[PDB]
Design a binder for this molecule. Structure first.
Ligand SMILES: Nc1ncnc2c1ncn2[C@@H]1O[C@H](COP(=O)(O)OP(=O)(O)OP(=O)(O)O)[C@@H](O)[C@H]1O
Ligand SMILES: Nc1ncnc2c1ncn2[C@@H]1O[C@H](COP(=O)(O)OP(=O)(O)OP(=O)(O)O)[C@@H](O)[C@H]1O
Lengths: 733, 732, 83
């Protein structure tokens, strides 16, 4: 059949990429796809608001905020008179497959429209349409929705398209403003979006280590005014030169009265006398460019949406398309709309703990983790073990390392250990560059790129005797490594050295940090998102500059070593025409065929090309080799330029996703450490682990069990979850 | 011989680099430098608020907003009681050389303090001072000021440290917001800083082609409410999908009553019914990273400040350090403070045209240009010549090109020409890809990267006959080329072809656009700032890497061809340890020396290194050669990595400086064209480059530039920035 | 072959050593034997390659002499074995 796609409601960054994926996948599968402009308003007006879409019509859209086809509150669609016209215009062009990208209400109205769709019986009773067309274009209206929203508002979905982007906007402002708050001191109250949902405010507060945060779901609890001011004064006594307070638009006390940012300014000015400013971030949070995450999320969903449409039968209920635990799923639409309204109900009825449950387990996670790192119980009240736990960074620098260290340390001190910081990886370890570290020592770290402790790729196998000596000297009871494949190898070497050295017979756990994302036992690694955004950032600027002539193709080398994750996913996000990687062999025939494709592409109006090459994807087919092939076989048609991105892809500042990934998983790692230490008063495979992300949830996997899942020769995992996405790039280009 | 440096007042991006330049230059010249924390508050409290600074204490500061040593409104310093303590604490450590980095008032209070400094006679009359210390630490207080402020507030100075950066912040928001104003037809009123000075609001409005702007210096004039709404409705009739109104905090009508953003929202909502939002940008404008311009400006000034201090004698009055016409100068501080208050006085007394003069010639320029491009007189009222004037882009794409075309076109239509757009450089010219272009056709262009008309390096010499034919066919009366060295060569070829072809006997002028900044006759070129900012960003990240690993040195190749501008100035802004360029020959001895310096640097705590190499700086000493040298000689101490940036370092959307440079100089070029047409075949002086030479913009005949040009390496012979080479070595 | 230098792995050389041979050959060019011959074992140094040395000599010889480089290659296995 035919597929109509529209964007309705508040706009979110990534709507454009969704539309693109729906048009491209629809055409690829041989459907016809129409744009419906201006949300449901276009559907009501009909005429030229419905226009068939070709391949070319959704190029240059990917990297652009908002929607190229428009959203619109449409009142007429709230009336049967309006919905009648809508059905009429859809039948007028044979569209009974509908893809609505929008928010909580947009989706609510789509659900209603499916149910009423045998309002073609009404159009029959008038001059609307022929008798048999009530049967052909039957009561079978096939509806699939995608949630576009910065709020992480909807209940079916783990993530909504636009949240990551908006969070980039929020943290861009927060990082910017920090520098003016140090100089001056100054306490800054910032007002973020979330009239009804606090997700954005919470994940912002986490990503900037904010000093306090206000959510509608979890009100402050009586006697917070004193309790907040006590914390702020403690900060000035710690010589912290600023405070950041994050406040959701719809913040509230435990009796549903608003807590406004101006009310917080007056409390701080009144009680503490500090110099204080309010910033109302506003519609910037809907602006800017889609982050890599939102582009890849939206892309995966557009594709799944179109699949869900075609697989649908008149029996299958309308669904919403979502990524839950990094897997595409269809959820019944009616039930999803219902559960979201329940959350609002719980709040209205002062059942706040309910409102938090109803938001989900991950929402409670962010919240709870935030508290642990934001508030410290006075030393008196944290009793606890006389255990020394060490934190270290191993491998190349990776954005998020500092956030992870901050989390581990604070969680460990909260758990009542003494925390030791080991400097310069195993280098420093061997040279006993070890010093105790405290709560304040890691203040300010969340948003710092690189590694403050310092990192080195050097492995510990040659320095076992020296390293063991330091563990003895410093009475190190356990170890937390934050790092890449080198860290993994470090654990295996220390595991084997246990027999020769008792000092290693302690619990050791690692959390993965590397721009490459090549650590076995985790689908993701701290810092890869930052590099994906850097690559995406870079391609955007490349398309921006030299618009006019075109007939140019850019070959761009990416990091990763043998791991193709960056090349592949950055290729998706940047809408690359090809991404060459080690994990999928290619021969000269493959290259010549892409070249011939791009040569035909240059006959269309999209006279540009973008080709990524993983840095170690082929010993013979180098970046130069491919540049030379493409240059030569393009001679009449196009030319090329090459860029080796290089070390910039480690990041300036870590992206929000890498900060919160670092923060959260490092905390989960320390919990595990303290639990292992509690069991004494002691060494097998299960006390040395990688803690990574596997599909739905985080799990501690013994290094012994990962050897068989590892390619040691190329330093990547054997099965890698993202290889199932390879068909997408070809389709979506 | 000791120097105190402090930051006072609103913080500005680039203060850190200034402090860095003052500490590094001070030490380089063998002075001792003390930090004074928290602006004048630190000076009042004394004690540990004053602390000596070493080399290492100002590393990693360059690339960071605000001030590492703090600013602080300090009321106490507004009182004699407070100023008495301050002097006491300065004498307590022997500091009578003072460098105050701050704003309007900060410098006002420094001036006052110098004058009152024989308030040591008061301290004597109490137990403050020994008698002879009133004489040793004499009435000789040596004060030098630098203006750190986003406001371009001060009168002595052409640019204040922080304006460019704040303008990046403003335009980052504006460009961000543009994509959400898509959906529907939202009108955005944005409230920028400028409580008394409108500069920031004006230059923002210019850089985003704003639909209206409110300045305290130039109030709207009565009956603007209708006149504004007429303009906004005209836009919706032109199908423009948004309006952007820029409003200075201290905006005012002609009777000094405030014009608030909420008042503008209500007018637009009330009169036109459009969906409308207000954004109060706020302290974001002081945040973020110092732009390349501010880092280099601050750096140049810190160095000159310290020089001005040491050259000072008890005779020489306190001065403020400034870059005027791209040259360091000292201006008397007292007189500079006085003139700035005069501006405020002119406004308070409703002499607004005076307030604009007093701000300076460049302020009038931005303003007047903005009007010409924002408001169009109805076709009826612009009469004018039946001249067709063509606009073209020649050379590699350069950020700003689109802004320049927008400006030329609109200024030409305002001047009443018919404007012709020539597509794909001389390629399209030869193939007659020529079409008339209008006011609305260039709407939205200011912030667009690349070239919408299209650009090609191809020269016209082989297609003279075809090109001439198109000039005849389309009755082209004059030509404006926006482009790089290729455009310059294009003018020379056409100049020579005049005898063979009458069609070229018309006025032709070029404005320079290239990332390289290698066009003879101009100290700057449209697009170089955009690239500098990209390199700076990139180098910052690279050092961040190098600092994580430790004992690492990066060798990084940069663009420019034989032109060392980007390598050199990006090196300054990134705090590079070295920048190798064509224009300064270096031998193996020079390389070995930098290696030895970095080897000693690795004994300090800043165990990182950053080395830039211009891409065509030496045929033998390649990027690999240098990487191999450093790697081998560093074997016990450090390692290296190399990155070849590649032409992506040009960046994307033009930076605010390149948008306004494009806009302004292209308008000045059209003025010249219409004036030449009005005087009516021709001579050397009707073919020109319009570039920036030191103080002012000048039209220089291409014939006169041949002798100033290196045609073999396509760079100018004398290049102004080579005098900055000592800085990088010093400030590293 | 009466070479002016032969760089080999078994005797480490640094940049000072190279610069000194270059200066020697530069003075040699003031005599009547205005030629020079430098051999480099193929794996004598990871950083100081054949190109590196060619580039050093070329640059520091600019007023005095120029260079050419030849990588002999597999011909050295021989045509026919020598007696
Ligand atoms: N109950 C409904 N019945 C019919 N149409 C509806 C209904 N609710 C919403 N719509 C249509 O959906 C459009 C978008 O809804 P809304 O304004 O709620 O956007 P949204 O992004 O879903 O916002 P939110 O996330 O706050 O609910 C409306 O303009 C209206 O045309
Ligand atoms: N008239 C004055 N006499 C003494 N000190 C002054 C005076 N004006 C300002 N200062 C000093 O400078 C500080 C305030 O500077 P101000 O608030 O004017 O900031 P500025 O950045 O220098 O100027 P601008 O307000 O234009 O950005 C005060 O705390 C005071 O210490």
């Amino acid at each position: 059949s035919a597929i109509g796609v529209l964007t309705s409601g508040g706009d979110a960054q990534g709507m454009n990429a969704a539309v693109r994926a729906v048009v491209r996948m629809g055409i690829y599968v041989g459907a016809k796809v129409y744009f419906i402009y201006e949300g449901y308003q276009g559907m009501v007006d009909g005429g030229s608001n419905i226009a068939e879409a070709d391949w070319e019509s959704v190029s240059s859209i990917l990297q652009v905020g908002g929607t190229i086809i428009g959203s619109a509150r449409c009142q007429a669609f709230r009336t049967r008179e309006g919905r009648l016209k809508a059905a009429c215009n859809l039948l007028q062009r044979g569209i009974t497959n509908l893809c609505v990208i929008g928010g909580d209400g947009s989706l609510t109205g789509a659900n209603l429209f499916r149910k009423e769709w045998s309002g073609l019986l009404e159009e029959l009773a008038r001059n609307g349409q022929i008798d048999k067309e009530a049967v052909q274009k039957y009561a079978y209206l096939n509806v699939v929705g995608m949630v576009g929203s910065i709020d992480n508002d909807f209940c079916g979905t783990d993530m909504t398209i636009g949240t990551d982007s908006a969070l980039h906007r929020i943290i861009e402002v927060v990082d910017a403003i920090m520098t003016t708050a140090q100089s001056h001191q100054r306490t800054f109250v910032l007002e973020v979006m979330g009239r009804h949902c606090g997700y954005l405010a919470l994940v912002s507060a986490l990503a900037c280590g904010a000093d306090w945060v206000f959510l509608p779901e979890s009100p402050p609890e009586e006697g917070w005014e004193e309790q907040m001011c006590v914390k702020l004064s403690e900060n000035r006594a710690r010589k912290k030169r600023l405070n950041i307070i994050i406040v959701a638009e719809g913040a509230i006390d435990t009796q549903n009265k608003p807590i406004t940012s101006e009310k917080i300014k007056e409390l701080v000015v009144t009680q503490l006398g500090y110099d204080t400013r309010v910033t109302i971030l506003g519609h910037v949070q809907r602006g800017g460019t889609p982050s890599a995450f939102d582009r890849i999320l939206a892309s995966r969903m557009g594709v799944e949406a179109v699949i869900a449409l075609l697989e649908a039968t008149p029996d299958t209920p309308a669904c919403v398309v979502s990524l839950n635990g990094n897997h595409a799923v269809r959820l019944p639409l009616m039930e999803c709309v219902q559960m979201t309204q329940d959350v609002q109900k719980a709040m209205d009825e002062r059942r706040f703990q309910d409102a938090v449950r109803l938001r989900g387990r991950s929402f409670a996670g962010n919240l709870n983790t935030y508290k642990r790192l934001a508030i410290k119980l006075p030393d008196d009240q944290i009793p606890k073990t006389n255990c020394n736990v060490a934190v270290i960074n191993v491998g190349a620098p990776a954005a998020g390392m500092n956030a992870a260290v901050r989390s581990a340390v604070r969680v460990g001190i909260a758990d009542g250990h003494r925390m030791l910081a080991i400097y310069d990886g195993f280098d420093g370890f061997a040279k006993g560059q070890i010093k105790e570290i405290g709560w304040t020592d890691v203040g300010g770290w969340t948003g710092q790129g690189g590694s403050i402790l310092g990192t080195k790729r050097v492995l510990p196998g040659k320095y076992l005797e020296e390293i063991a000596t330091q563990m003895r000297t410093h009475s190190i009871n356990a170890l937390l490594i934050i790092g890449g494949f080198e860290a993994y190898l470090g654990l295996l070497e220390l595991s084997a050295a246990r027999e020769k050295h008792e000092e290693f017979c302690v619990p050791m756990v690692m959390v993965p940090a590397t721009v490459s994302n090549n650590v076995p036992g985790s689908d993701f690694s701290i810092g890869a998102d930052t590099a994906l955004n850097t690559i995406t950032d870079t391609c955007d600027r490349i398309k921006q500059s030299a618009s006019g002539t075109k007939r140019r193709v850019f070959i761009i080398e990416t990091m990763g070593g043998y791991c193709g994750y960056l090349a592949n996913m950055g290729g998706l996000a940047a809408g690359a025409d090809a991404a060459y990687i080690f994990e999928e062999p290619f021969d000269i025939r493959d290259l010549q065929s892409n070249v011939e494709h791009l040569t035909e592409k240059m006959k269309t109006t999209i006279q540009r090309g973008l080709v990524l090459r993983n840095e170690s994807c082929s010993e013979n087919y180098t970046t130069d080799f491919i540049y030379q092939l493409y240059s030569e076989e393009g001679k009449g048609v196009f030319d090329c330029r090459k860029n080796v991105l290089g070390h910039m892809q480690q990041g300036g500042a870590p992206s929000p996703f890498d900060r919160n990934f670092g923060t959260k998983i490092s905390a989960r790692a320390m919990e595990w450490i303290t639990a292992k230490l509690k069991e004494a008063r002691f060494t097998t495979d299960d006390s040395i682990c990688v803690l990574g992300i596997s599909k739905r949830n985080v799990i501690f996997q013994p290094v012994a069990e990962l050897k068989k899942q590892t390619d040691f020769e190329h330093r990547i995992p054997k099965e890698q979850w993202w290889l199932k996405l390879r068909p997408l790039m070809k389709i979506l280009a």
